[model samples]
Structures are given as C-alpha cells and as structure tokens.
Target: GSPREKVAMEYLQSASRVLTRSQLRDVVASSHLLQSEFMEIPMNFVDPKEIDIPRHGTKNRYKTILPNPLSRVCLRPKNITDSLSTYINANYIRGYSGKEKAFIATQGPMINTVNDFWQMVWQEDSPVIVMITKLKEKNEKCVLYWPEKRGIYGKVEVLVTGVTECDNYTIRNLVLKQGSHTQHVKHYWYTSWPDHKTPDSAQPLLQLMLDVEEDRLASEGRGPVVVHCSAGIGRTGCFIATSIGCQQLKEEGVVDALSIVCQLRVDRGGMVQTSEQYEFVHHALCLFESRLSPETV
Candidate 1:
C-alpha cells in the first residue's frame, strides 16, 4: 500500500484545474449535495393580508405585514422603515410615549442595492439602542432601541453575544423600563441557535429569547419590542410569528389557525417565511408556554 501510494502519488502529481461550466455541471450531477444557493424572498410574494383563508380556516385577530419580496428588507429589523417596514403585529407594543419617538428606522436606508435594505443601524432619538449583528457580518452594527424621549438614559442593559467573539456579532437586548433612566450594561454569551450551536442544544437559544422578553415586559411594561438580525426580516419575522402564533393558539385553538392568521395579516400585514424563522416562532412559544427557565441545565 505504501509503495502503491508512492507510485500513484508520483504518477498523479499534477494538480487539477478549475472546471468549465459544462465540466462543473458534470461534477455537480455526479455529486451535487455540496451546492449552496442564495435565495432572496420572492419579489412577487402577495402581502400576508392578500393570503386568503381557505373556505375552512380560523379568523385571525393579530396584525402582520409582508414587504414586497423585491425590496431589500432588513435581515433583523431595528425600527419601522418607511418603504420596507411591514407591520406584523397589530397588538404589538411600542414603548415610546411620544409620537416623535416612534420606533422608526433612521432612514439609514438599505446597505446594498437590494431596495430599502439597511446595512447599519441608527435611531432618530436616543436611549442607546443596540444592534444584533449575528446573522450578518461582524462589521455590522445594526440597532434596536426604546427611543430617546422615553427617558432611557443611563439605564442598566445587557449584551447577549450569540457567537464566540465578544467585540462583534452580538445582540444587545436592553433591559429597562421605557420611562426610566440609569441603565447599566451587562454581557452574556450563548452559542447561537440557528447556527454554530454547541452540544447541539436548543435550550441556550430558547432561554436567551425568553430572558429578553421577560426582561422587557417587566422593565418596559409596554412592548416597543425592538428586534433585528441580518437582512432583518426572515429570522425576526419567525421569532415574532412564533410568539404571536402561540398566543393565538392558546386563545383560539388550532382549527383554521393558519387561515385566520393569513386573513388577520390582510388587515394588518403578513409575516413568516424562511423555514428556520418559522420554526423559531414555535420554539419561542414553546419556551414561553413551558415557562422555560433560563438555566442552561
């Protein structure tokens, strides 16, 4: 085997060249499991409201919005954008007391030419909003805020880095009442859920979201509920959908649930897409329903 190995090595010392399109096609056909594709949300997608409940589904009470697929929606939305922001929650809470402090995007605009897709984060007011930059690049500093006039000055806060590096690619979920000041910063690390999870545990991720939600409700009272991820749409959409859907199921039951939901989106808007995001919504609900404790054990 060693001699054969040496002979084969010597005989085949030349390196292979990059394949032509046809050659690449042949290789792919031979073994295509290693392919990856970049899929943007379909541009022609109908608004969630336009999604009709079949003659046989439940009535949706919640509000949801779907952006035109062609627009560059934020990967993780920080505030409502004028052109791209699709309001998904009807009863969704906004923590700001003043109309001037509405959770609106800084008109920073989208980063790439993807139509209203924002690359960085900014707030019209202050309160030191944070950006959850995990799903996007480490250089990204997108933000979510509680608004300036809300009196969120110097309030205690915590930073949750879902990845290993502390400096970049982290989410800072602020924990303070909207109308209160004197905030501080706290930091915690968890292996991210959708990607790079350790020991294959979903608990860390589920707990992180729950912790943020509880902290928000307890501290903020009202739900400005600022959230975002890379692209600011898919994962964020699913996370909200999961929480709202679970709440809906608890109140109404599963019968005609999806339909009721779609119709309700028609009234407000529609949300939910990207399989990973959809599952996240359910997971968030499950975490809440089980009253999942933050203990990683």
Candidate 2:
C-alpha cells in the first residue's frame, strides 16, 4: 500500500470517538479527509455464492452485492426448501441508544420480489415504510408494489386508504390484512434524491427526517420501520443517520454524525455510500439543528 493508504487506515483504526457538531462540520468541509475517511470505513459485503441458496428466481439489483449475513432477514414457512424458500436482501438496522431492530434497511423491491417484500413487512409488523427512490430513474429503481386502492400480494392485502402530498414526498396510509389479522402501515415516498448522487439541498431531507421521526414515535412498540433506496445504502443511510442525529441533538444538545454513520455501517455495510453522501448527512443535521427549540437545545 502507498503512503496515503497507510495514513487513511490509521485514521479509520482510531475512529472510535464521536464527532461534535463543530468537528462534524470541519470533517465534512475537508474534502481530502472526508473522502479518505469515507473510503476507509469497512464495507462488509457478503458473497451470495457462499450461501448457495436459490434466490427465489429473483436477480439481485447489484451483481457484487449480498446482504451482511449477520443482519439478513429470513422468511418463515411451514416447510423450507432452498428453491421455494422466500428471501429478501434486507438487514435489520439498529438505531440510536443501541436500539435493536429500529429499522430494516433493504434494497428497493424488484419485480420478482414484490411479494417477498410485502411478506417481510407483514411478518415484521412494520408500521411504516420509507422509500427513497422514484419508480424509474435512468433505470427502474423500484417496482410499484403497493396498490392505489386495494390489492393482494403473497396473501397480504394492501389497501391505500389515504394519500397526502407534501412538497418533496408523498405519504400513504395503508391497511394490510392477512387471514383476519389487520395492521396499519404508513408509506413515505421521497423523490427528491437523484439517481446516483446526493440532493442539492438537504432541507427537504431534514424535514422528511422530522416527519418520519414523528411517525416512528406515534407507531412505537411496533416492528421496525422499513427503509429502502435503489441499493439500500446511499439515500437510505442518509435518512437513518439524520433521524438518529436529530434525536441525539434534541435530547443531548450535541450530535455525532460520524459515530452514527459508523454505527450504521456496522449494522449494514456500504451505508452512507459516498463521501458526498456522508457530507450531506452532516449538512442535513446542521439544518435540523436550527429547527430545534430553545428548551430542547
């Protein structure tokens, strides 16, 4: 390895402490350090070949991608067959305060895995689903898995009871029914994020964070909220980081974006995908700081 690689590795090895708001700003502003630090963070990509399980005839969204085996989700069935077994490329992500199963970070649903997607949500009893991509980018990012009025997917019936349009996102109230069991789930589709890059402004995302946080609190004691983007890392990482950062700032009067990003990666690799995406998380948190009440601060 070159001198640059050695220095970068040193910083990563010692990146144990949390960053304060001022330190986070400085780190994000330093272009070279930000890139090095972002790259230095571990990416624990698992090899799908190692599992040897049939992926339910569904093609992965990314060729060299596999969910971190430790955090991967598994489907329940009376009889399990590798060929017929249900699997989704998703991870159960931990949140602030070391909360377990606070969210499920996963790739956007593919056409073939739409039923599997609903089955996971139903099994987990997820009360909210936060989607961070459009139906079509340069390519198809995610399938339209949810129904406008009512439809069934894999024995689960989803009915869109209401829809509210916001400036940068749309909120859908959905009811899921399975064999006389019913559950309410909220869906937030945010389209402001670009296909392969971060947004120009972070305000919309910060507001989305606030709204999602409110929804999470209102739906407390339920299953993890499902969040996804194209690859389930970039935009999804930013949203989860901002959500955790806001809570830290409001409750503790200080935020640690660096530690939050690191924590996210520990749960699911490749989170906060790029140096630019990492910077955007800081920017969003800074904007969120301005909105906190005096007493909260």
Candidate 3:
C-alpha cells in the first residue's frame, strides 16, 4: 500500500469528544492540522458492481456515484416488475447522535428522473429541500425540477406560493397537493459555492445551515429533510456535516467532524467528497460556534 492509503482510515474511525466553544474555535484555527487530517480520511464511494440492477445507470448522474444500499432511499414501486421505479440515487443520512433518516442526500434531478425526485419528497414527507447547485454549471449540472407557478409531476401537484431572494441564495415556498391533502415545502437554492474550488468564506453556508435548521425544526411530523448538490456528495456532504456538527457543538459542547463524516458514509458512501470540502465543514462549525451564545459546561 502507498503512504496515503495507510492513513486513509485516520478520520473514518476517529471518535467524538466534548469541547468548549473556545476550545472548538482554537481547533478550527489550526488550518494546517485540519487539512492534514482531512487528507487522510477516505471517500468510501460505492462501486457500481455492488448494485446489481441493470439499466439503473441511466438515472444516475455519474457512473461511480451511487448510494450505499443499507440507507438508500427507495421510492414506491408502481408495479412488481418495474425495477427502475423503486430506484433513486439518494441516501438517508443520519443527523446528530445517530438519529435515523434526518436528511435525504441525493444527486441533482436529471431531465428524466425529475418525477422520481419529487415522488421521494412527497413519499417521505420531507419538509425542506436544500439544492446547492446551479441549474447549469458550465454544462448542464441539474435540470429545473420545479415549476414557475404551478405544475404536476406524476400524482403530485406543485405550486410556488412565494419566492424570497436572500443575499446569497433564493428561497421558494411551495405547496404540494395530492388529491385533497396538502403539504408545504421550503426549497432553498444556494448559489454561492464556487464550482471549481472551495468558497472564500463559510459565512453564507453557515447562514444557510442555520436557516435550514430553523425550518427543519418548525415543520411538524415531517420526515428527513432533503439536501442535494450536483453529484450529491461534494457540497451536499458539507452541508449535512456542518448542520450535524453545529448541533453537536451547541448541545453537547463538542464537535466531531471526523466521526460525523464517517457516519455519513456508513449510510451513503463518499460523503464530504473532497479534502477541501471537509475543511470547509470545519470552518462552518467554527463560524457556528462563534455565533452561538456562551455555554457553560
């Protein structure tokens, strides 16, 4: 094995610890060490062969990007013979303290699978959808899944009630109706993250996390929140990691970026895609701790 492969499990198997807000800030300040640790953590991406379904590749954004079977989100099957109906490239990500199904991490909706994406949202009873990619980044990264005012996808009727333009992102209030039943969903499209590399500051991402948290808490009887990027592993991983880490920091006075990332892969492989994305998660937690009021523990 090479030198890099030897240290690959460094963070994947690390444990969590309680720390003061000040203590967390000090750790975040150590940029070099954080990156060094991040570099060693492995991306446990799923191999296509692990999933034996034929013709499922057509729905996936990338050949190598697939969800771990254990925690993968399976859509409702319309019929018994439909192998593709039950398939969607999304995973159930755990939240703080190994809470099951806290968020659904998925790839951007392709032109063909847009209905499958929305069906997952409606079937799971998700209250929020965090989209972190542009509709077209250079080439087509993701198709526009929602409608301008009102539209129907499969059995669901989606209507845009309101749209709020924030400084870094846009928020659209949506209502999904099925027959006589109605459900409200908040869609957040964050466009600040640069395509090529890491963002300059973590403030916008942190703010978006906080906003998502607030909305997540507000929605009652909702299933896991849906969070997605183009490939569902890069920025998507960072967002879920930051959200979970911040909660741990606030409540337990501790932050475990390493173990959190590992747990993410336990559910869906290749979370926190790049080393830089891992560092950004730490930075997001740092900003979160700075904003939180004093904690005595």
Candidate 4:
C-alpha cells in the first residue's frame, strides 16, 4: 500500500478516539452526529493555567476549571490594582449565527466576591442575570448577592426595586447605584434544579429559557445577559446550550447540540459536566423542536 493510503486507513480507525479536550488544532466544526454518538465522546476540560493568572487565583469559585483569562470579566473602577481590583470568573458566550457577546457565563458569587459580581453587572451594562442554583444545597453553593430591599457592596448600592414570582423561579428588579451612575438590572433566580442531578422534566427549563430569551430581546440595547450556577459549569452550560439550540431550531429547523457544547467548553472548561446533563440538553432541544409548528417560530 502507498504511504498516504496507509495513513488514511489509520486516521479512519482512530477517528472516534479524538475527544474534544485533546486541544487538537484541527476539529471538525458543525459536524452532525447521532445523539448516541455525541454522548459517547468523553468529557474534556482545559488546563487551569490557560485561565489562571497569578493575581486572579483568589477570585475563582472553582479550582479545577478557571475562567478563560482572555474572556474573563474585568471590574471597572476609577483606579485598578491587583490586590484590590475586582474580577469575576466569567466569560462572554456566543449566540446563534455566531453573535458575539450574546451571553455571560460565570460562577455563582462567593461571599467575598459579591461586590465584584455587582461591579460586573454595572461594568458590562448587563440587563439580565439568570441564577440556576439555590443558595444552600448540601453545601453553600452561592452567596446571596442581593438584598431583601437594599444594600451596599463596595461603592455600589443595590436596591431590590421589585419582585415577581413564577412557577419555577423568581425575578428581582434591581437598581444599581455607583457614584452618579444608575443602572436597572433584572435578576432571575431559578431554584428547582436538584443538586448533582439533572431535572426529571425539561419543561420548566424550556420555559425559563424562553422567558430569558424574551427579556434579552426586549433589552436589545443592553450588553450580554449574565448566567451562573454553583460552580458555573454544569447547569450554566446546559442553559446556554439550550438557548442557542432553541434559536437554531427556530431559524434553521435543526439543532447542533454538539457544536454548541464544544464552543462553550472552549470559552470555559468543563461545560455540561455530566453526560446526564448533556443528554438532558438533547431532550430539551427535542421538546423545543416539537413546539415549533410550520409557520410560527
């Protein structure tokens, strides 16, 4: 056999072994796959050094997977110093049609970094925040970053201007005051997801995704919407993928869940942490696809 022919056969034999986390320079993009095939690929996480800067180590919510430094949120202040400078472990996620700055995925706020969380909202002009975890699970998942009525974090003042309750979540209307600047931000706290396991039903999540997308569309002039879970990878990844998937289904009549998750892991490592979560994404997209009729999006 010719040398080229021998190499071609070897490549075909080993093609299935190419996991997403290998950091290979060449990857097949937008490749369609069966749901079973997608789940068979091993979960891949990027190296921590890729995102962990010396000064920002203390700000990360999880040690294993740090935020990609190139896309990490930089807190805006009058003067910035490494010691006192505020940084949030977050990344700007792309939307369907490759829209840049479509969403922001981050870890839940720690007690010490609550101020930094708000600072990010003010800095990025974020109009919506989607919280996917409860404050306390078996452990302390995330700190309560907002107030009952109003409170101050650093130089910023956060006032819970209003509250609205839904079946599976609650919405808080917050007004942030920093110096003479004031910004209105909507905070959505979704507390139904069971800890360490995917939800039994995808309807509630699908509804939440629709509502969040509606809010995002209404706030078209604002920056990316902020999304977070406990460690900011598992549930966060699911929500972002579902959102992008819904858009693709509506516009293109097909969903590429694989490419969405791959893109997410590139922005922040270990997205869709569990295969259960990954399978749940396909279920959610399937459910969404069923709802879209011939003419209506």
Best by TM-score: 3
Q: Write the per-residue lDDT of candidate 1 for residues 1-297, one digit (tens) a residue.
A: 113444433322322222322332343244322121112112122345443333201111112322332222223234444322332211221221112211211111122221221111111112222233342234532323223222222222223322234322343433343234323322222325344321133355454445544554564423134444443344444444444444444444322213322322222222343434433344444444445233244
In candidate 4, residue 51 scores what lDDT? 46
Instruction: Give all TM-scores, in the order shown.
Output: 0.37, 0.89, 0.91, 0.83
* Candidate 2 TM-score, C-alpha based: 0.89
Error of 3 at 34 (Å): 2.1
lDDT of 3 at 143: 86
- The root-mean-square deviation over C-alpha atoms between each candidate and the true structure, in angstroms, is 19.5, 3.7, 3.0, 7.9
Tell me the spans in candidate 1 whose CA falls farther than 4 Å from its real position: 1-191, 195-201, 219-223, 246-270, 283-297
Q: Provide the clashing-pair count of each candidate structure.
A: 35, 0, 0, 0
- The best-first sequence of candidates by TM-score reads 3, 2, 4, 1
- Clashing pairs for model 2 are none
- What digit string (tens of lDDT, one per residue) describes model 2 on residues 244-294? 888898888787666678778767767888888887887787777667665
Candidate 1 weakest ten by summed lDDT: 34-43
Q: Give the range where candidate 4 is weakest over 10 consecutive residues by summed lDDT.
A: 18-27
Score each candidate by Cα lDDT. 0.31, 0.79, 0.84, 0.75
